[PDB]
Amino acid sequence: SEAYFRVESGALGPEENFLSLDDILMSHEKLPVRTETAMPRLGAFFNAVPQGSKLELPLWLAKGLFDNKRRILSVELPKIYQEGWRTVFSADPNVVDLHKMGPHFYGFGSQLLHFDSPENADISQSLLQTFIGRFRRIMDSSQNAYNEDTSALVARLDEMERGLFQTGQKGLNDFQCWEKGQASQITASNLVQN
Amino acid sequence: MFCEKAMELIRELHRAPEGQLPAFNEDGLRQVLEEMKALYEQNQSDVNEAKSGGRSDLIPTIKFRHCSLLRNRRCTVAYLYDRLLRIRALRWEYGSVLPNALRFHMAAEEMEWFNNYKRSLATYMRSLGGDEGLDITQDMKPPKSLYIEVRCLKDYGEFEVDDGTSVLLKKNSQHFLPRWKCEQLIRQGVLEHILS
Amino acid sequence: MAPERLRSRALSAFKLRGLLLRGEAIKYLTEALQSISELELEDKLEKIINAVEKQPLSSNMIERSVVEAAVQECSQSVDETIEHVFNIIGAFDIPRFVYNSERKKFLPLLMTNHPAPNLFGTPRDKAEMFRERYTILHQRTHRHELFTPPVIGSHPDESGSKFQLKTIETLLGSTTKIGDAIVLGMITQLKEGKFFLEDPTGTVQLDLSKAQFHSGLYTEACFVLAEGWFEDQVFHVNAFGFPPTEPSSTTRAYYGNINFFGGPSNTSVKTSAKLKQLEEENKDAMFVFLSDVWLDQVEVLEKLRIMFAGYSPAPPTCFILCGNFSSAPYGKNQVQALKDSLKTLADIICEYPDIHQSSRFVFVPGPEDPGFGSILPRPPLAESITNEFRQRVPFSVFTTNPCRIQYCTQEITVFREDLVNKMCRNCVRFPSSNLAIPNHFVKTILSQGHLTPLPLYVCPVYWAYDYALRVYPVPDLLVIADKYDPFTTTNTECLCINPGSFPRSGFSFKVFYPSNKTVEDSKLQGF
Amino acid sequence: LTPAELIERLEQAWMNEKFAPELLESKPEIVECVMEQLEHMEENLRRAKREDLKVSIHQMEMERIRYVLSSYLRCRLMKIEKFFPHVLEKEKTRPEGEPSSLSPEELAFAREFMANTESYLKNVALKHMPPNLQKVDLFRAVPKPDLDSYVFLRVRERQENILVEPDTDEQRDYVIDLEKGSQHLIRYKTIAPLVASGAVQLI
Amino acid sequence: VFGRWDETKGEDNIDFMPTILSRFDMIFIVKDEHNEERDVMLAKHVITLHVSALTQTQAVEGEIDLAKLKKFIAYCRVKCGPRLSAEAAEKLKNRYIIMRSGARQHERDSDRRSSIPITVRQLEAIVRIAEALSKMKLQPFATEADVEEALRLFQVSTLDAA
Amino acid sequence: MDAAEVEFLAEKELVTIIPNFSLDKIYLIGGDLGPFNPGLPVEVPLWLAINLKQRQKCRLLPPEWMDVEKLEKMRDHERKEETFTPMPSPYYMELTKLLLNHASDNIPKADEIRTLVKDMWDTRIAKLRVSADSFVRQQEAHAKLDNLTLMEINTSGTFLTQALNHMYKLRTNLQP
């Protein structure tokens, strides 16, 4: 009942959760942009940063600086969300490696939609269809890998999918422990290790 | 680049998803606060220059540093809050008096928060019944048998079971006792329930 | 009411608060609270349980003694106890803390895996002495104006220059013949005229012929911030000085309320409400400091007679006997000479009630005293030479040199293992002369932050207990009672005094008022 | 309200609170009456002899009732601790007539929890931060309960014209009827008044 | 080259080329030291070792069985790849430069090339040893402690060179 | 909700025992029971029945639905139909485990009963898997699961509900 649970990710929603460690780590990942105005003193980090300069900076910073008329900067999509990689996902979602390409693939992609890109519709449909394609294999592997090494199953899953995988594993193990009668015993908590 | 030091705190907490509480990162918190101080001082100088001097091109840099300050605040608050979540879980997982090796991981203010939380929870539990409250920390699992057989793991002292009666919790001795009496000691690892 | 009902509610209160009572403990509680009415019982129990939680409990199971102590905390000595306002702490009693570099904080000896100090030190301890001295000075220096640029600082901010410290391992190679570099390290000679600089990373020879010294007593084994350049396997100094000092307020601002000084309190004495309100009423305390107290010759007993005559008005809170009690340390004669003269001193001070019942007579032996020699921290002399004094003057102590006095709201260090002339006679280039000598000496001792800033063969120390000779965080009063002339001075809001060689110095004892934060520059030739 | 029916309503509240994403409206009558039954039965059983079989049977039944009550209250306390700014704002803004989501005891606990948390955050970091950054509103820091969660339910009273809303497009919305005894998997926000009124039982 | 090390011979004890010798991270030159208490303890150890062959192969405290250590090595190898921390790298850099200067001056004082060269591969060897020490602990980063232990092990090989 | 809690609710179901002890009617809070007469059947909740069996104080009878022919008919009907068929108890799996683990001596043909209940469980879990896959593939917003039992739902429902929450947010992320 009263176990520890972190703040849940809100990255698929309209805005991410303020206190979510997953959302913070997701928003740290870098996004390509172009500066639409010059920025004095900023050449110390990248003298001024000149106008029209290409940069890759964190998503949190890009969301802070961005506006719908692109005064400070304008945003480019990462290549995995552009039309080339969308087609690879459309081919077969089950063979791609969203741990390499993420590890927060869906959360980062959902947060890109707030930059008013012309291909927001294509991005949204791509994310939804990637999830639909990968659902059955996530379900089967999570609910039927029992008491074995799950690293091969978990390797190519993004963090959202890995969360779902652990949920399925929890259900499987709970029912199996009940069936074997191990759910009856009263046990010392996980803090008993020290 | 700014806000990189803020990520170390977040990564430290994220890479322990099991819920264990690491040592409080006093110096990391200090460093991010000093980074915020430097950001704020630079922004004060730049905004004074932009307003009094009428220099307009500094405005993007003002917004840059303000956004960085907001990020550092978010990371600090999230770190402290998740540590509070773990500390809050400890009361239910283990008990009231945390082990000393774990208390050294906690900050003094974290211990103050935990003491306030313990006092408030005790008040709430005390206010439930007609008198003597209801200890909702007990009965964490559905009841099966009224009595259970338990085995002493530690050399505890004596443990009262009725008004005038007690059991000596010497290691490897086995006692057949009420579940509601033994639950907390089993939870804390003093006793082992030995039927399955 | 029924005693079973009282037991039930006491157990319920502790159990809701998450605590288990031993059988004897609940028996004590359920007979101690029989006077309590139903209108107040829960308030009483909550008061008791909070008092219990104040202690450092190791288990959820509560013993009889803890409940007893909680009820005492609820009923007696709740406001104060009389003995907190003054206490005397030997050098071997001081607790040990280790500076963790990767946490950047001091941890207790109980928390680290470090071994416990012993007199017969290991080879590791001898290294750890000087490594730890370096460590304290290093961490202190990096938090002064020599701190980070910062890495956020930009150029328009941080338009002015700032020092950046280097270790000896960094200056070899492509760093050769750079224009300006500053290194923290110990100054020492391999041979006469062959000066070198040493830190935990390495050692390098010094060309200090052109060095601009920053006006201090730079001895062997002092730690310095040498500024220059490296070339031809030599570090060529431009400037040469001590690392900067730190006040104890800044030290506490960084490291919290930790009790570096000693005593039973978990925090420092000046950071707790009990002491903070006791100091309002402790207005009239006063201490006396006295060295070269050669009571083995009865001339000094005549001096003690006129001291008691002079300062019977306003009795002193304590006297400080700064060792070297032997004017005639020839051999076995001195032992019974000291025993007889201490008997005589006890007999004379028995003549009053007030000084006898108030003043603490505390003794701190030095080199010219029986027992252990000039090996620091100096242990107390033999108990057979103290018992007769103690049995008829209970307000007295025989303890180490150096020694630490905690007042209700001040902290004092007493030390007399003589080194002023030692500082003067082995300066690297030269000492700094005239009436400035004591000021340069206290600058040296404060910047070095250790009562012995000089080599071991010049001033031996037990290796594992070298931490006890530390002057960090800075005390409020620093009494260095050398055979040298008496003096008074101050630096970084620390008072520093030598009561001096009283027989030579025209009978110039000194007397200190801690509540007033002041001292009298007395001269008792006129008594 | 028969004692058997009281324990049945306790179980209904237990499961509904388990599966609902938000904190449901309080059942103070249920909690008070169940505690009264437990205290009364303790009084009955302390006045009976040892080795009696019916005493043990009653004690076992009491253990079961105590377990459900403790678990229900634990779940509610978890929800309160998770969403403490939002339940407090809801209680402060509550009009006259709808039931509270907090008992007085739960409300006192929630106020104490919020004060303690804000004090800790201020003391540790937010008094040290620059002056305009020192105030975080926890109403925005803490996430809200997610009402679009999918829940299983069993329906106890027949309902008609319940609107399913698959996605953004209103054209794809369509109505359904919930027959008594049927079981459904549906978004919570579409059924929340039914859960409040007891027309459906979350499972 | 002469069976025993024959300590007067020095560099003539080695017929290996500098090319092959530079490819070895560590070169433990092992000498059989004749010390009386060492020999007594060693003989008692060997005799007990031969005696204990019939003792049913009972478990032992404070060590890992070979079958378990094999699996543990495989697990750490497949799971953990560490890196050097920045300050650790600085320590390693400075110590490497010092060791290189020492090796150069030793060869100059001898007026002859040593059979064991001290090269950039030996720098990377120290790096690899530190990473292996961290991989034993499954730590993503190698600390100054790991670098110090790696340098301690490598300075046996540098003793073997100089 | 845990499987142990599902078992806790299954434990409230009524079963018939034959006491070997005499006891008058007992007035439990959840409804009165008894009187207990030696050698005669009396209906009691499953937790009490299991406790009395463990304490050797009664003989448990199988429920009316624990018969091999009836269970074979139900199993074949389940295997033939596409939807979940009505089950003989709302907690049949939990009932089977408890009764057969504690009272196989009393219940004849317990091996056949356990195997048939296992067959029904496997068929219905396969049907539930098909339902989940169809929901996600066809992008449903609602499903009808009339004859599923609580244990059967609880085995997969947490995973399924989390997946559907993510799917809903993914298909509504363009709403503003």
From Swiss-Prot, chain A:
SUPFAM superfamilies: GINS helical bundle-like, PriA/YqbF domain. Keywords: Chromosome, DNA replication, Nucleus. InterPro entries: GINS_A, GINS_bundle-like_dom_sf, GINS_Psf3, GINS_Psf3_sf, PSF3_N. Residues 1-15 are annotated as: Not essential for folding and stability of GINS complex, but may regulate accessibility to the central complex pore. It comes from the Eukaryota. The keyword Nucleus applies. One of its GO terms (cellular component) is GINS complex. Gene3D superfamilies: 1.20.58.2050. Pfam families: PSF3_N, Sld5. Signal peptide: none annotated. PANTHER family: DNA REPLICATION COMPLEX GINS PROTEIN PSF3. Required for correct functioning of the GINS complex, a complex that plays an essential role in the initiation of DNA replication, and progression of DNA replication forks. GINS complex is a core component of CDC45-MCM-GINS (CMG) helicase, the molecular machine that unwinds template DNA during replication, and around which the replisome is built. Component of the GINS complex which is a heterotetramer of GINS1, GINS2, GINS3 and GINS4. Forms a stable subcomplex with GINS2. GINS complex interacts with DNA primase in vitro. Component of the CMG helicase complex, a hexameric ring of related MCM2-7 subunits stabilized by CDC45 and the tetrameric GINS complex. Belongs to the GINS3/PSF3 family. This is DNA replication complex GINS protein PSF3. It comes from Homo sapiens.
Curated annotation (Swiss-Prot), chain B:
It holds the Pfam family PSF1_C. GO terms for biological process: DNA strand elongation involved in mitotic DNA replication; inner cell mass cell proliferation. Keywords: Chromosome, Disease variant, DNA replication, Nucleus. Changing residue 152 to Y: In IMD55; lower GINS1 protein levels and defective DNA replication are observed in patient cells. Its main location: nucleus. One of its GO terms (cellular component) is cytoplasm. It is found in: Nucleus; Chromosome. Changing residue 83 to C: In IMD55; lower GINS1 protein levels and defective DNA replication are observed in patient cells; the mutant does not interact with GINS3 and GINS4. SUPFAM superfamilies: GINS helical bundle-like (SSF158573). Required for correct functioning of the GINS complex, a complex that plays an essential role in the initiation of DNA replication, and progression of DNA replication forks. GINS complex is a core component of CDC45-MCM-GINS (CMG) helicase, the molecular machine that unwinds template DNA during replication, and around which the replisome is built. It is linked to Immunodeficiency 55: An autosomal recessive primary immunodeficiency characterized by chronic neutropenia, natural killer cell deficiency, recurrent viral and bacterial infections, and intrauterine growth retardation. Postnatal growth retardation is present in most patients. This is DNA replication complex GINS protein PSF1. The lineage of its organism: Eukaryota, Metazoa, Chordata, Craniata, Vertebrata.
Curated annotation (Swiss-Prot), chain C:
The keyword Ubl conjugation does not apply. Its main location: nucleus. Transmembrane segments: none annotated. InterPro entries: DNA_pol_a/d/e_bsu (IPR007185), DNA_pol_e_bsu_N (IPR024639), POLE2 (IPR016266). The keyword Cell cycle does not apply. GO terms for biological process: DNA repair; DNA replication; DNA-templated DNA replication; error-prone translesion synthesis. One of its GO terms (cellular component) is nucleoplasm. Keywords: DNA replication, DNA-binding, Nucleus. It is found in: Nucleus. GO terms for molecular function: DNA binding; DNA-directed DNA polymerase activity. Belongs to the DNA polymerase epsilon subunit B family. Accessory component of the DNA polymerase epsilon complex. Participates in DNA repair and in chromosomal DNA replication. PANTHER family: DNA POLYMERASE EPSILON SUBUNIT 2, DNA POLYMERASE EPSILON SUBUNIT B. In eukaryotes there are five DNA polymerases: alpha, beta, gamma, delta, and epsilon which are responsible for different reactions of DNA synthesis. Component of the DNA polymerase epsilon complex consisting of four subunits: the catalytic subunit POLE and the accessory subunits POLE2, POLE3 and POLE4. This is DNA polymerase epsilon subunit 2. It comes from Homo sapiens.
UniProtKB/Swiss-Prot annotation, chain F:
Its main location: nucleus. There is a cross-link at residue 109 (Glycyl lysine isopeptide (Lys-Gly) (interchain with G-Cter in SUMO2)). The keyword Phosphoprotein applies. Keywords: Acetylation, Chromosome, DNA replication, Isopeptide bond, Nucleus, Phosphoprotein, Ubl conjugation. Gene3D superfamilies: 1.20.58.1020, 3.40.5.50. The modification N-acetylmethionine is found at residue 1. It holds the Pfam family PSF2_N. GO terms for biological process: DNA replication; double-strand break repair via break-induced replication. The keyword ATP-binding does not apply. Belongs to the GINS2/PSF2 family. Component of the GINS complex which is a heterotetramer of GINS1, GINS2, GINS3 and GINS4. Forms a stable subcomplex with GINS3. GINS complex interacts with DNA primase in vitro. Component of the CMG helicase complex, a hexameric ring of related MCM2-7 subunits stabilized by CDC45 and the tetrameric GINS complex. Required for correct functioning of the GINS complex, a complex that plays an essential role in the initiation of DNA replication, and progression of DNA replication forks. GINS complex is a core component of CDC45-MCM-GINS (CMG) helicase, the molecular machine that unwinds template DNA during replication, and around which the replisome is built. This is DNA replication complex GINS protein PSF2. The gene is GINS2.
